[PDB]
Amino acid sequence: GEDGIFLVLLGLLMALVSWSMGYVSAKSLQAYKWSYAQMQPSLPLQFLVWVTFPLVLILFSALFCHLISPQAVGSGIPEMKTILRGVVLKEYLTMKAFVAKVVALTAGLGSGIPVGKEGPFVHIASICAAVLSKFMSVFYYSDILTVGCAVGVGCCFGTPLGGVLFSIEVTSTYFAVRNYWRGFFAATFSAFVFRVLAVWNKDAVTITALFRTNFRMDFPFDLKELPAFAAIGICCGLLGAVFVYLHRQVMLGVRKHKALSQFLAKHRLLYPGIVTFVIASFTFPPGMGQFMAGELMPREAISTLFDNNTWVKHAGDPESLGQSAVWIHPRVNVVIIIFLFFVMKFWMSIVATTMPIPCGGFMPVFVLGAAFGRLVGEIMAMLFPDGILFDDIIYKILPGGYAVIGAAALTGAVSHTVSTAVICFELTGQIAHILPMMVAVILANMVAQSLQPSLYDSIIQVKKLPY
Amino acid sequence: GEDGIFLVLLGLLMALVSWSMGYVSAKSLQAYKWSYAQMQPSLPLQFLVWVTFPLVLILFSALFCHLISPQAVGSGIPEMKTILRGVVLKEYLTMKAFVAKVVALTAGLGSGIPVGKEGPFVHIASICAAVLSKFMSVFYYSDILTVGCAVGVGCCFGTPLGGVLFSIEVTSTYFAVRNYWRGFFAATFSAFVFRVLAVWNKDAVTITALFRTNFRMDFPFDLKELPAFAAIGICCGLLGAVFVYLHRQVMLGVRKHKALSQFLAKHRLLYPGIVTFVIASFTFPPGMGQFMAGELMPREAISTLFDNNTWVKHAGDPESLGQSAVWIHPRVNVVIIIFLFFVMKFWMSIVATTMPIPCGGFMPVFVLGAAFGRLVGEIMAMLFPDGILFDDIIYKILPGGYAVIGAAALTGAVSHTVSTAVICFELTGQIAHILPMMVAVILANMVAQSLQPSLYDSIIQVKKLPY
């Protein structure tokens, strides 16, 4: 029927837009790395590239938004929740917002600064839903935008099921099973289009291509590792709430402090500029980025944190882990560099999601949880270098498995959802740690819900969204 | 809070009851096989055991129900849907119903006759929910029984996520996200208890232990096999509707034909008796069960149909497939024996779900879809004995992968749900065929929804449930 065509169009267009963004953002990241390596000998020149490439891209993001649509800043979820609660802001679903968000997000994702695709994609998909609906019908709203949410999350990273589930939770409170199936169909169409696009251009982009883990796990699961996975959850819920709190505190700070707001309104590009500069100066690989793997960009970070190696075991011999050899520092022990990645990227992600550019929170917190989980798993590997015997089987610790759990847990404590476990499963391509993950994400949600709001609901508060 | 304790109690009790049933049903299946092998030389004696063991157990199931609670017959879902639509039948949620359903289902699952655990478990879990609620609070209803549905499906086979998702779809139309999370927590508790029970008794039972597939799949997926997976879906939707239709036709038949109803009301144990006898006489291994793998009981059937072997390749040398050597018949080609399994078990499952015992539809249709999918995959392996080259990679056909898709598709066309894909993923322990499965189950649902009702809604019609 006409609604079936709407969903086919949704999936198709979303996947196309998502792939295009991912392509150009990856080409920009490739240029970033190439330019940086073209300046190899000279350190000041290396610094220049390392800070100006992101600076230009983030300044462009902010400026483009301000010029075209300044309502295309931030994530989309908080405001889509407002729209879905009846209070529709009609400048959000405009084509100017589309263009602004699309181009500016591409620039933000090709900068390497921790901003997120997940979140703004769902706004891009809700604008696309609204536009597609008009193009079809005129040439209800909640239904249309709920499916837009599903396909936004689904087309972002390549997670049909997890995306629909995420939508149901992040936006509505009482979903309809029709919209669950409508979103399902549309998200699977998005995935199919994504697969054929990754055939035409032989992949080399996206995040479905990567993040695919190759863990060799034994069937029964070491239940003695369950306490550590439960601990990941508890602590990720605590840290998820800390993220939400601190992000809201800096979000409020920049506007509630009168001097701050006035200054940054006179000079609009001051805030994004200085934030980008300091993040990039701390992630400068020969500066502080040697103790926090600053060379690694968001997607490479996960690819490495989700590896089937034990960094603390193969520290004497690096380059056997491949791209995960940047975690092994000559002097500093791996564990401490993952700790420093986590600490540095915590504050970096807090202030980059406060920047006036289209920015989401999932991916920044995903890399943070992967770091936290890996740290736990590498410590577990030090505590058990022989593995833990539960039944009669010895289970060598998979620190990368712990990282997947942590990613889902921290990002589920920030978004107050349990569907991040499913997103992780599909992004990772494996479901071996199903019980450990479920436990962790539930525990994370519990702790975080008992402490702070969700990233989205807290932003609603700061932005005084009607709701 | 008190609701958190309710969910902990739900999960705990459900897992305990489910495990206990599974244990005794497996011990009964072990005795069945042992007794049959104790009669090895004599064929009439072998026949006796092969038909009387199930006969006694099914007759007991029917009689026990009739005596204790004759409202503990059939599945639970259709009637739980009625209760959840406001029209509460209060003899359904009694403790007499609990006992009847529990004991009689154990007997039915230890008989080897295609009856299902999934379906009656959700009634057992809704009774348990009601009882637990009273034990806690007195010593709303929809919320309670919706979570009961989630944990029923979840604790049945060991599928937390898939179970909650199934519940949302099979019962309500507009679920609440609170109940989604409440069901999630309770189902993960069930899974945790299940894991520790499978540690205390070193597993050897359940279905989470088995069904775990070991497919070695290449990352990009052969998109040329996608047409065959889509075909599985289309055809499984057709056959799903045929199942629903024919089941309703025999369900009506036995009561709408006045002579039939009168006869079977005078002799209550006639219908179950004759049906059990004829199913078991056709599944007699030296009789017709050599051309349809009748030796295999429901769970072994899937374990074999979900194997990583190609039966049509290793036909000259059997016993390399292990328990899947019963599919290789000396004379009849594997493909035709899977076809005959499918045909025979189609009608067998249609009439065993019409029997007056606690019986569900998922598992019977799950084995049917696994058979259909395997047949498709084995034919695909004959058509491509070298594999299909898509990109530059040759992809050897995994007929067992096709079986997992088919299982989810036929059971998703019978239940009108897309969550069977998730159930399959978790039961199989692998999510490699995510896109192929999604496509298939969506296509199945589409075709089946355009043809017949769901098994549950059709039963509602036959049983004239208020709804």
Swiss-Prot record, chains A, B:
Protein residues bound to chloride: 75, 362, 456
Effect on the protein upon substituting residue 377 to Q: No effect on gating of the channel
Tissue localization of expression: Predominantly expressed in skeletal muscles.
Ranges within the bilayer without spanning: 70-75, 76-81, 95-110, 111-116, 117-132, 147-158, 159-168, 293-296, 297-304, 336-353, 354-360, 361-376, 400-416, 417-418, 419-432, 436-449, 450-453, 454-456
Mutagenesis or variant effect for residue 122 to L: In MCAR; loss of chloride transport; changed calcium channel activity; changed gating of the channel
Mutagenesis or variant effect for residue 374 to S: In MCAR; loss of chloride channel activity; recessive
Effect listed in the UniProt record for changing residue 430 to R: In MCAD and MCAR; also found in myotonia levior; reduced chloride transport; changed calcium channel activity; changed channel gating; weak dominant negative effect
Span of the annotated motif Selectivity filter part_3: 360-364
Effect ascribed to mutating residue 76 to S: In MCAR; loss of chloride channel activity
Result when mutating residue 378 to Q: No effect on channel function
Domain of life: Eukaryota
Intracellular or extracellular location(s): Cell membrane; Cell membrane, Sarcolemma; Cell membrane, Sarcolemma, T-tubule
Cytoplasmic side, ranges: 66-69, 82-94, 133-146, 169-179, 255-268
Motif range (Selectivity filter part_2): 116-120
Outcome of substituting residue 50 to R: In MCAR; altered chloride channel activity
Disorder this protein is connected to according to its UniProt record: Myotonia congenita, autosomal dominant: A non-dystrophic skeletal muscle disorder characterized by muscle stiffness and an inability of the muscle to relax after voluntary contraction. Most patients have symptom onset in the legs, which later progresses to the arms, neck, and facial muscles. Many patients show marked hypertrophy of the lower limb muscles. The autosomal dominant form (Thomsen disease) is less common and less severe than the autosomal recessive one (Becker disease). Myotonia congenita, autosomal recessive: A non-dystrophic skeletal muscle disorder characterized by muscle stiffness and an inability of the muscle to relax after voluntary contraction. Most patients have symptom onset in the legs, which later progresses to the arms, neck, and facial muscles. Many patients show marked hypertrophy of the lower limb muscles. The autosomal recessive form (Becker disease) is more severe than the autosomal dominant one (Thomsen disease).
Subunit-level organization: Homodimer.
Family: Belongs to the chloride channel (TC 2.A.49) family. ClC-1/CLCN1 subfamily.
Additional notes on this entry: Each monomer is composed of 18 alpha helices arranged in an internal pseudo-symmetry with an inverted membrane orientation. Most helices do not traverse the membrane completely.
Protein name: Chloride channel protein 1
Lineage per the UniProt record: Eukaryota, Metazoa, Chordata, Craniata, Vertebrata
Shown part of the complete sequence: 115 to 589 of 988
